[PDB]
Structure formats: structure tokens, C-alpha cells
Amino acid sequence: TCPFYKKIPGTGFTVDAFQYGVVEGCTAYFLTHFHSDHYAGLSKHFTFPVYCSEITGNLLKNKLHVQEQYIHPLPLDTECIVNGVKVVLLDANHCPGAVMILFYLPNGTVILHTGDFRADPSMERSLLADQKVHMLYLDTTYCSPEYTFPSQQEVIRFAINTAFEAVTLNPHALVVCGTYSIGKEKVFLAIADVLGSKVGMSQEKYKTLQCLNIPEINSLITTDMCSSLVHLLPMMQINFKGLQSHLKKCGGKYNQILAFRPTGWTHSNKFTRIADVIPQTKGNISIYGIPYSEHSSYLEMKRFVQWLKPQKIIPTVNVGTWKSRSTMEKYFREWKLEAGY
Ligand code: NI
Numbered sequence: 598t599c600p601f602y603k604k605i606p607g608t609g610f611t612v613d614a615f616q617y618g619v620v621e622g623c624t625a626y627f628l629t630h631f632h633s634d635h636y637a638g639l640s641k642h643f644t645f646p647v648y649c650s651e652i653t654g655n656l657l658k659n660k661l662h663v664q665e666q667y668i669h670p671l672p673l674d675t676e677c678i679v680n681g682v683k684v685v686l687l688d689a690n691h692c693p694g695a696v697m698i699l700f701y702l703p704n705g706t707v708i709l710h711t712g713d714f715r716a717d718p719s720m721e722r723s724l725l726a727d728q729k730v731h732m733l734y735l736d737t738t739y740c741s742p743e744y745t746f747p748s749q750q751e752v753i754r755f756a757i758n759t760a761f762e763a764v765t766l767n768p769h770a771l772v773v774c775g776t777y778s779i780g781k782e783k784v785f786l787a788i789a790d791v792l793g794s795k796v797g798m799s800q801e802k803y804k805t806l807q808c809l810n811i812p813e814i815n816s817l818i819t820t821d822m823c824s825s826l827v828h829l830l831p832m833m834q835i836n837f838k839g840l841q842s843h844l845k846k847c848g849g850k851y852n853q854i855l856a857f858r859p860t861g862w863t864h865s866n867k868f869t870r871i872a873d874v875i876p877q878t879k880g881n882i883s884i885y886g887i888p889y890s891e892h893s894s895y896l897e898m899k900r901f902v903q904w905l906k907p908q909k910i911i912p913t914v915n916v917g918t919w920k921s922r923s924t925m926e927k928y929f930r931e932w933k934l935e936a937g938y
Pocket of ligand 1: 632
């Protein structure tokens with residue numbers, strides 16, 4: 598049964614609620630982004646209206662085979678009427694096609710559902726600037742002050758500089774980047790651009806990337822592994838055994854691997870600066886864990902909420918334990934006392 602924090606009161610709507618069967622009273626199912634914990638339950642047999650971004654609807658049609666007649670893509674930054682209720686989709690600064698949803702209820706209440714997001718000051722000049730928000734359904738993934746990580750730009754600068762140095766020292770080194778979902782495409786695209794290579798990958802991952810409306814993508818990716826010196830592999834294969842096995846397959850074209858695992862936060866964050874990150878090495882294989890996050894840090898989250906000044910916060914992540922819930926509620930109250938709302 599669908600949890601309360603997935604239901605939008607005063608509407609027929611649910612958000613990211615496809616794994617509960619037919620939800621009683623639901624007339625429209627919104628999907629914030631194409632990550633499996635959120636789309637869980639969707640397939641070609643789904644026959645209710647799904648509302649989403651254009652990019653998410655490309656992925657629903659091509660990857661999950663949802664039939665076209667049930668996919669309702671909406672443009673961003675545009676007031677739309679859905680089953681009698683005004684809604685707006687906003688960029689969530691998460692993965693490609695990810696949105697936040699503004700609902701203007703018939704009684705005058707305004708609700709923001711962030712989906713998954715990485716808060717940014719640029720959001721302070723979107724259509725959120727223009728009216729009051731009563732209720733915030735908040736991505737609280739990293740809602741504790743220990744969660745610090747660098748900007749995405751500092752992390753990509755580190756990756757490009759590391760890869761370019763290694764391959765210029767050894768033109769027979771291969772770069773490998775791990776993936777298991779959409780998101781974080783800048784990691785492998787930025788490294789292939791500095792090396793003058795396309796990114797090589799499986800047919801299934803090429804198909805996924807072709808749904809993303811990324812400009813000039815036909816110039817950047819390929820299924821011809823032999824022509825590429827940046828390869829994409831499943832995240833599970835980014836270990837010494839998996840990489841040794843891959844190097845065998847390349848037929849002596851290469852004699853070294855430099856590999857990247859873009860994680861979110863790891864506790865090497867509470868001690869080490871990005872500049873000081875070092876790899877794990879075994880023989881001619883080195884593996885870097887780089888803290889590339891597509892969710893808010895604690896400080897980015899706190900700034901967004903103190904700017905928005907909502908009347909009520911409903912967390913959507915870390916809700917299953919009483920200790921997590923009590924921790925989050927304490928920070929919400931601190932933020933409200935410090936800012937004065
Ligand atoms: Ni996500």
C-alpha cells in the first residue's frame with residue numbers, strides 16, 4: 598500500500614508510486630525521473646496516464662515499452678492543466694529528464710515535490726520566485742552536516758586532469774568508467790573530450806543514451822569498442838578481477854587501466870580534499886572513487902529551504918527509522934529558528 602508521502606492531498610495525484618497496484622482514487626501518476634526505485638512497477642501493460650518530462654517519456658517508450666497513448670510529456674517552465682489542476686515542471690539538477698513538480702491546488706495551497714534534486718542558487722530565479730509554497734516534499738538523502746562534497750565542476754576538473762596526465766604518459770593506457778543508471782554522464786563525456794576519443798559501450802547503454810536529447814551525441818558515443826579508448830562498464834565490474842578480465846578482451850591493444858567509480862558520498866569525504874584523492878592500485882590497474890553527487894549536500898539543502906520558507910516539510914528519503922526521522926525534524930527546526938520563518 599502506497600505511503601502517505603507519495604500522495605498529493607486534494608488531488609487525484611500520486612508521485613513515483615507505480616509498485617502498489619491500482620492506487621485508490623488516483624487519476625494521474627506522475628514520474629519525476631527514470632531511476633529504478635522511482636519507476637518500479639511500470640511496464641508495457643500499464644494503462645493509466647503517466648505525466649513526466651520529454652526525456653523521461655523517451656525512456657518509458659524505448660526501454661520499458663510503455664505504450665505511447667498513456668505517455669503524457671510536459672514541457673518545462675510552462676503552466677499546464679492536468680485533470681483540472683495547474684502544474685509546472687522544473688529542472689531538478691539530478692539526472693537527465695529529472696523534474697520537480699509545482700502543484701497549485703484548487704483551495705489556494707501550493708505544494709513543491711522536489712523528486713530527487715541537487716539544490717542550486719539558480720533555482721531561486723526559476724518560477725519558484727513568484728509565489729509562496731505551503732508544503733515541501735523534500736529529497737533528504739544527505740540531510741546531516743557530515744555530508745560534504747565538492748562542486749561537480751571541481752570533480753570533473755580532477756577527472757579530466759588525471760586521465761589526460763595518465764594517457765599522455767602512457768598512450769597504451771585504457772580509461773574505464775562505471776555506470777548502472779542514467780546520470781553522471783559528464784564524467785565519461787568530459788574525459789573522452791580531453792582525450793579526442795568517443796566513448797565505447799554496450800548496445801543496451803548506447804540505446805539508453807540515445808533517449809537523452811544530449812546535443813551532438815552521435816559525435817560523442819559508439820558501440821565500436823575497438824575504436825575507443827574510454828570504455829563504459831557496469832559498476833559491478835569496477836574491481837581488480839573485473840578489470841583484469843576486460844583488459845584480456847582488448848587483444849593486447851592496452852597494457853594499463855585507469856578506472857573511475859563515481860559514487861555519491863563516502864566517509865573519505867569527512868577527511869580528504871578532492872585535490873588529495875588517491876587510487877587503489879594492483880599491478881597495472883588503478884581505481885579512483887570520485888565524489889560526484891547528483892543530490893544536495895547538507896549546506897545546499899539548508900540554503901534552499903531557508904530561501905523557500907515552507908510552512909510544512911515532508912521528507913521523502915530516510916523515512917524508515919525513528920532515529921533518521923527525529924534527526925531530520927531537529928534540523929528543520931534549527932533552520933526555521935535561525936532564519937525566522
Ligand atoms: Ni534518483
